[PDB]
From a paper:
In keeping with previously reported crystal structures of HP2P family members, the structure of BlMINPP consists of two domains, an α/β-domain and an α-domain. The catalytic center of BlMINPP consists of the nucleophilic histidine (His-45), three arginine residues (Arg-44, Arg-48, and Arg-142), which coordinate the scissile phosphate during catalysis, and the amino acid triplet HAE (residues 339-401) where the glutamic acid residue acts as the presumed proton donor during catalysis.
To this end, crystals of the apoenzyme and of an inactive mutant in which the presumed catalytic proton donor Glu-401 was replaced by a glutamine (E401Q) were prepared, the latter in an attempt to trap the catalytic phosphohistidine intermediate. The structures of the apoenzyme and product complex were solved at 1.65 and 1.71 Å resolution, respectively, whereas a data set collected at 2.40 Å resolution from a crystal of the inactive E401Q mutant yielded a structure of the His-45 phosphohistidine derivative. Analysis of the resulting structures indicates that, unlike previously characterized HP2P, BlMINPP possesses an unusual inherent flexibility. On binding the substrate analog, the enzyme moves to a closed conformation where the full array of interactions with ligand are present. The lid comprises the majority of the α-domain residues, excluding only the residues of helices Ala-222–Ile-231 and Ala-337–Lys-357, which line one side of the active site cleft and the latter of which contributes residues to specificity pocket B. DynDom identified a maximum rotational movement of the lid of 18.1° upon ligand binding, corresponding to 82.3% closure of the moving domain.
Residue numbers in the entry: 7 to 515
The structure:
Amino acid sequence: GRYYSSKQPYVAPNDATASSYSKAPKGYGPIYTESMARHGSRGLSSYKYDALLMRMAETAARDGGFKSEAIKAEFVKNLSGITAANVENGYGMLTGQGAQQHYGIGERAYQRNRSLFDQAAADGGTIAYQSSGEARATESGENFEKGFNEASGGRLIGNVSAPTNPADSGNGKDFQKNPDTLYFHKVQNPDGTSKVPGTKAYDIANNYQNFVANDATIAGAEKTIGDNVDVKRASHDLLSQIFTEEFLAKLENGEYKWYNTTDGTKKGGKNCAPGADASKDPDACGEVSKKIKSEYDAAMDLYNLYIIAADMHNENTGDHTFAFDQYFQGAYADDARMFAWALDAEDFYEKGPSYAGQNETYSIAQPLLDDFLNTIDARVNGGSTVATFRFAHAETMMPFAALLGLPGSTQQAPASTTDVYTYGNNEWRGESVTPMAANVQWDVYARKGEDPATGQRYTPIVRMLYNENEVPFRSECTPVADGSTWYKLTELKSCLAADHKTLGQDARI
Ligand SMILES: [Zn+2]
Ligand SMILES: [Zn+2]
């Protein structure tokens, strides 16, 4: 493991963690739970990083550009192996690991709220499954659903809310498409529909896309980061394990250049991964304009294979093994850290807290935060939906984390194109903010009856898990008592809003 950026595989809680979540205060019992999770680990999106590096390898073999015969053979074996794994799985598809991530999250979701769901099975409580409508998010949800149902012995299968707009009529029939809360970052919805002009959802997505496309600070900071000399040095360092100085020198002065075509040249034809059927897996045929024209390009492509390889752990087996981690050992691990920063920086600036003086990058998550609260109200107010399980994307989680002020997402970069986001000046990391299957879950409990002092019902209370670790809400929020991670619903409605005001003494039970 190491420096996987937002390709970090989900770290499931150990038995100690899962058995030690805090108990709600005396008199409070479960009434609702909800979640939003990023899809699980996926393979390569297309025949691209693996394609281009194989074209480079073929040229190195022809021109004597590998450091040794053993090194040549090992590099080609690694590339062939990851390509073969993707051809078999289908490019872009959920990996075995990605399925297991969601299966486990689903199992433990039932287990943590066994009392809630056993009551629901008896009382007619219903479960709502939602996705953005994107196939990998829905398929992640399907695995969560399988795990949840196995853990509960099928006793909640008859308790699923029928969607009014299902993801599909087959395996995804239980999933309601909700791209306003799970794909708020784009006008174009995954199902081929688009948000309607004049609606809040449209403006949120459109204003955001226009903002990031044209913002001078983001553009300048990204140029500064793209020109980073130490990343260029790390690129050379990484590649010199494999290729000769003479070969890499020709790359650095433009004598070598590879395109994603049949022969690696611009005049080559459209290519397809070996063994793939273009009609069944269109993503096995890459875009020809994709290219390697510098050491930076080749090294970042190699780094991308290293991080996806971790996500493809289950496919790293038998007749299609690969060992990209061997290029990132010892001093070379520090190169991985540089490449991780380069990737994290782009996400940070475009989708995360980004630079000080704006909130355009993450205010877009407001519809999801609104729904997190609104679905609690629906239940508290007499509704039958006891859980809402949502499945979405890194583009959903990153701004959601920043808007909530979750750990890791509390620091904006300076308002500067030169004094930029770095690992030394910012806590944000893809690996911890938005790993594969990243998720936020809230549990809601209530004390029954009317408070004799108010003649009204007791305020419900809420507790959060982030990647299945129990965490406090943001520091402005006051919990129900000293030493508690439970918070009044009234308090969250105040303290999670943009003013972040606490109700103070009125937050205490
Ligand atoms: Zn296989
Ligand atoms: Zn060198």
